[PDB]
Symmetry: D2
Subunit: 357 residues, 4 copies
C-alpha cells in the first residue's frame, strides 16, 4: 500500500555502527593481532595492590604503584612479545623514567597503549545470589575520548558469570551481554578498539563439561547482543576465559582437552570475522597459561581468529617476586618477566616447549 520516505538509518538492515574511526580501529586490531605477540594486562586496581604487595613488603603507594608498572613497561625488549598493554586509569597519567607518559612511552616503543574502562562489578540485583553486573556506561564517551586524547587506542571491560549448581541465571546472561555490547559500541564511537570480556569464572566445583556448556550459552548471547547493537566486527577483540574444570572441582585438564573444549566453544559461537581472542588467565598457573595457549594454537578445530593472550598474574607473578619491590631487583624481575612473555609468545605460535620452563 502506502509508501514512506525514511532515513536508511531507521531501517533494521542498515544498523552497522558508523564511526569516522573505523579505519584506525582496524589498523589497531592489526597491530594487536601480530603473530607471536600478546597483551600485558596491567589494569589491577589500586586496592588490589595492597594484597599484591604484602608478600614483598612493598607499601601500597602511588609511587610504588608506578614502580610496579615500570618494572614491566620499561623492561627493554618486551615489545618483541607484547603488542599492547591494558593500562589502569592511574597509570595512563604516570610517567616513565624519561619523563614521557606511559602512553607516550609505549607508543614510541611501538606498543599500543590500552585502558580498562569499566567501573567495576556490582550486585546484579536480578537473577541468583552472587551474580554481578558491571558499571561504567554513564559518561562513557567523555571518559573514552580523554583516554584517546592521551594516546590510548584500545580498551578492556570485564563482566563475570558465576557458575552455581551447574548454571547461571538468564537474567545475568542477557543483561551482561547487553552491557558488553553497548560498551563495545561506545568504545568504537570513541576511537578505542574494544576488547569484550565475558568471563565465566573458574570458581567452583563444576567440571569441564559444565564450564563448556555455560561458556557456550554465555558467549552466544554476547554475540547476539553485539549483532543487535551493530558492532564493527573487524574492529573488536574478545577476551574470554578458557574452558577448564572448576577451581575446586578437584581435577586438572590436560592441555589438549582444554584446547579441544575451548576452540570448540568459540567456533560454535563467534562469527568467523572476529579478529582476535586474547585469553584471560585467571586461576591458571603461569605455566598452564602458557601450555594451554600453546595447545590451543595446535588445535585442529576451526579458528580463523588470532588466538593469543591477555595475561596479568600469568605474566607477572615470578617477576614481582624476583623484583621484590626494590630498585636492585629490577634486573632479576625483568628477566622473569621477559621469560614469561617469551614463553607466551611461543605459545601463541604453537611452539611452546615445557622444557623451556
Amino acid at each position: 500500500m502506502s509508501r514512506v520516505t525514511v532515513l536508511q538509518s531507521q531501517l533494521p538492515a542498515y544498523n552497522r555502527l558508523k564511526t569516522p574511526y573505523e579505519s584506525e580501529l582496524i589498523a589497531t586490531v592489526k597491530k594487536l593481532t601480530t603473530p607471536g605477540k600478546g597483551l600485558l594486562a596491567a589494569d589491577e586496581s589500586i586496592g588490589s595492590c595492597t594484597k599484591r604487595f604484602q608478600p614483598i613488603g612493598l607499601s601500597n603507594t602511588e609511587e610504588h604503584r608506578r614502580q610496579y608498572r615500570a618494572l614491566m613497561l620499561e623492561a627493554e625488549g618486551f615489545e618483541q612479545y607484547i603488542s599492547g598493554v591494558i593500562l589502569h586509569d592511574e597509570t595512563v597519567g604516570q610517567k616513565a623514567s624519561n619523563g614521557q607518559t606511559f602512553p607516550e612511552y609505549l607508543t614510541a616503543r611501538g606498543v599500543v597503549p590500552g585502558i580498562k574502562t569499566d567501573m567495576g562489578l556490582c550486585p546484579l540485583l536480578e537473577g541468583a545470589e552472587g551474580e554481578q553486573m558491571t558499571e561504567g556506561l554513564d559518561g562513557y564517551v567523555k571518559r573514552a575520548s580523554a583516554y584517546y586524547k592521551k594516546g590510548c587506542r584500545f580498551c578492556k571491560w570485564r563482566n563475570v558469570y558465576k557458575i552455581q549448581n551447574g548454571t547461571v541465571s538468564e537474567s545475568a546472561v542477557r543483561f551482561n551481554a547487553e552491557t558488553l555490547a553497548r560498551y563495545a559500541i561506545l568504545s568504537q564511537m570513541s576511537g578505542l578498539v574494544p576488547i569484550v570480556e565475558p568471563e565465566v569464572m573458574i570458581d567452583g566445583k563444576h567440571d569441564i563439561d559444565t564450564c563448556q556448556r555455560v561458556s557456550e550459552h554465555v558467549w552466544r548471547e554476547v554475540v547476539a547482543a553485539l549483532q543487535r547493537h551493530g558492532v564493527i566486527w573487524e574492529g573488536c577483540l574478545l577476551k574470554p576465559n578458557m574452558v577448564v574444570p572448576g577451581a575446586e572441582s578437584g581435577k586438572t585438564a590436560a592441555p589438549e582437552q582444554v584446547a579441544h573444549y575451548t576452540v570448540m566453544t568459540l567456533a560454535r559461537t563467534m562469527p568467523a570475522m572476529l579478529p582476535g581472542v586474547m585469553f584471560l588467565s585467571g586461576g591458571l598457573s603461569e605455566v598452564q597459561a602458557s601450555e594451554y595457549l600453546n595447545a590451543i594454537n595446535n588445535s585442529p578445530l576451526p579458528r580463523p581468529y588470532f588466538l593469543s593472550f591477555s595475561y596479568a598474574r600469568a605474566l607477572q607473578s615470578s617477576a614481582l617476586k624476583a623484583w621484590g619491590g626494590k630498585e636492585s631487583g629490577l634486573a632479576a624481575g625483568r628477566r622473569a618477566f621477559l621469560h614469561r612473555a617469551r614463553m607466551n609468545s611461543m605459545a601463541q605460535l604453537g611452539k611452546y616447549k615445557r622444557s623451556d620452563d
Copy 2:
C-alpha cells in the same frame, strides 16, 4: 535423564523481584492512585529555569528556584488534588517556610514526596539521527537509597522516542525499553515506586494514526522488557504520552478521539494488573490537558488502571505568570495553581466542565 538441584532463583519461572519493600511499595501506589488526585511534576532542571523565568524577569538562582517550587508546594489545600509530587534533586534538600525539608513538609501534609532519578538524555548512538537514550543506572541504588532515607517514596525516569518519517528505529525501541525495565527494578529494590516514562514525543508533522502505531509498538516493548526483568506490577506506575497528532501536523484532535486512541493503545499493551497511568502533558495546552484527561476518563474502552495526570507546565503556566516571581504574587499564583489542580482532579473523575475554565 540426569537431575540437578538448583536455586529456584535460577529458574526462569521464578524470577519475580524479591524485595522487602514490596508491601510499602503497594501502599504507596494506593496513595498515588487516590480518586480525584494526580501528581504535580516539579522536576524541571536548573537549566530550564533560566528560560522559564525569563518572561517573569526572575533571576535563575537557587533561592528563586526554592521560591518557585514553594509557590506550589506551600499552597494550602493542594493536597485535596495532588497525591504526590515529583521533586527535582535540588528540591529534595530545600526547606519549606517552616524549616522542614520539602519531603518532610509534604509528608506531613499527606502528600507523597517523589524524585526524578534519571540522569538525562544522551545521543543513542545506535539507530537514527536524533534518537536518544537515557543515562543514570550507574550508582542508581546508592542514589535511590539516600532519597528514600530523605523521605522519598516514589521516583520518575523518562526516556523519549522521536517519530521521524512515521517510524522510530528498533534500536531505540529495544534499548530504551531495556533501560526503563532495569530502572524499575532497581527502584523497587530501593524502596521507591517507579513511574516508568516512555514518552513518544509530540514533535513533528505526523498524524494521530502514526502516533498510535508508534506508541503501541514502543509501549509493547517496554512491557516486554518489564516482564523480562520480573517487575512487581502491583508496585509501579506508567507515565505515557497521550495519543495525539503531531505538534506540527496542522491538526488538533477532539477530546473523544484522543481518548479513543489513547485508551485503546494502552489496553492493547499494558497488563491488566498495572495499577495506574499518570499522563504527561507535554505540548498540550493547560486546558486540553484537562479536557483530554476527562474524555479519557469517560472512555467506554477497557481501562482497569487508575487514569490520571502527572503534569508540569499544564499545572504551572498560569500560576507562574500570576506569581510573577514576587512575594506579592503568591496569592494570585496560588489561585491559578489551585484552579488547574481542581480542574484536573475533576478530569480524573470524568467530571470536568469546560465551563469552569
Copy 3:
C-alpha cells in the same frame, strides 16, 4: 544521511494485521462475549469417543457421534446460556434433525458455530521429555477458509505445557507461544476469531504456587509472540487453564484462592484490550468448574476482559450419563445439560449458588 522510500508495511511499527474481516471478527467477539453466556466445547476427537462411550455401552460410530452432539446442540433453549460451540471437524458436516448442517442450525438459533483447527499434539523434540508441540499450520488457510464458507466464525487451537519438577523448558515456552501466535494470525486472515489456548496442564504433584509461576511465564510469552505477529487484539479470545494445584498434589484450592491466583496471573500478562477469557475445565469436577468461575467473577482484582467458560466434560458429564446413548434418554440428558449450562451462565454473572447444585 541517505533516505529511502519503502513500503510502510516494511516498517516494524506498522505491522498490525491487515484483514478485510476485521469488523466481522469484532462483531463475532461481541457475540462471544455476551453476558451470562459461554461456549460449549464439543470438539472431542473421534478416537476419544471410544473411551467416552464405554460407560454407556454406546458404540463409537459416526452416527452415534452425531447423536451425542445432537444431544446438546438440539437441546431447545441452550442458546440462553451458550453463545458459540466449538465443533469437531466431523460435526461441521453433520446435519441436525431438520436437515440443516450443524453450522446452519446453530446460526439460525443465534449460536455462533466454531471449529477446532489444530491438528493435534506431537512430541516437541526439543526441551524436556514429555513436552509437546501442536501441528496444523500447514495448509491452514485453505482449511479455515472452507470452514468459514460452511458457516464457521471462530476457531480453537490448543497447545499444552507440562509442569515437571516445578518447571517447563524455555524451548516449549517459546515454540508453543510462536505456534499460537502464528495460528491466530492465519485465523484472522481467514475470517475466524481465534481462541488461543495455552494450557498449562493440571497433571502432577505441583502446588498452586508452581502452577501460578509457570502459567504467568507461559502466558507472558504467548502474549509476547502475539504482539510480534501483529494480532488484532480486538478480535481474539484466550482459553487458558485456571491456576490451581496439581491433580496429584493432594490439595484442593478453595474458590476464592483459585480466583485470586487466576485473575492475578492474567492481569499480570494479558493486555487490557484482550476481549475475553473462556476458561478450560480440564481436570475439574463439573461443580468446581462452576464454583471456580463464579469466584473468578467476584474477584476484586483487575479484569477488564469478559471472564467466562469454554467447557467440555464440565458441561457434558452428567448429560451423557443421563442420556445413556438412547433416544429415550434425550429428555433426561438435556435437563442435565441445561442445568450445567445454567449453572455456568450464573457463574459468569458471579451469581452462582452451590445450593442450586
Copy 4:
C-alpha cells in the same frame, strides 16, 4: 534459597540437540565437504520442467523427467566432482538404468543421496507485500524418516528474502530464521544432514552494498535462531546466495569484489564451527558461477568452512541444450555436464581458469 531437582534437559545451558544419529551426520558432512567436490542440485519441481523443457521440445512427463535426471546422474565419472545430489521427491523413487533406485545407484557410486524436504513458498502474510514463508514442518519427521530409509542422508530447505526499497521486514527476518532453525533440528533428529538455505534474492535494482547489508542481517538471525534451537553445528551446512548486485541494478560485480563481500558477510555472521557453505547460483551465468566461486576460494578473509557449490542451472544449462531431450544427445549433454562440474570442482580448489571455458 530453595533448591529443586530438575532434568538437566530443562536447563537453558544444556539444550544442544541429542540425536543418536550424531556421528553419522558428521560422517556425512565429511563426505559433503570433500576437497574439489560440490553438490548437484536436481530438486526442480515437476512444474518447472514444463518451462524447462519447452526450449527442447521435450514433453513434461514422469519418464522424461527421469531421463532428464538420468542425463546427469548416470553420467559416468561425475563422482569425481560431485559429492552429493539434492534429489526431488519424485526422483528418490525413480530407477537408474540398472534397476537400482537413484538413491541406491548414487550410493553405490559413492555419491551421497539428498532430498529437498521443504514444501514450497507461500505468502508470509506478515510484513511487506511479496514476502514469503516456507511450508513443510508439519509431519516433517515422518517424511524425513522414510527418505532416510530410502537411502537419503542429507536434505535441503529453502526460504527466500526479497529486497524491496533496500530492506526486508523484521517479520520475515525473524520468522524465516525460525522456520530454518526448526527444520534443521527436525532433520538432524531424522538422520539427515540439513543444508539451511536462506536465500536473499538477486531480484531487483539494489546494489552490492544493499545486498551485503541485507544478507548480513538476514543470516545473522538465521544463526541466532539455530543457536536458540540447539543445532549440531558439526552436522549442518549452509547454502546461501553470494553477495552480488541486483539483477536489474544495471551493474556486474567483478569476481574479487563478489568474493570480498561474500566472504566478509559470512565471517561476520557464521560461527567458525560451521562445516561448509555450498553456494546457490541463482541468477548467475554458468561461467560467473564458476568464476565467483573461484575468487571466493582465493579470498584472504577468514573462512574456516569448506566453500563450494550447490548448483542447479549453473551445472545444467549447457547440458540440457546439448542433450536436447534425446537418447542420441546423451553423450554431448554429458560432456557439457562434466565440463561444468569440472570447472566448479577447480573453482572450489581456487584453481579455475577462465581459459578453460
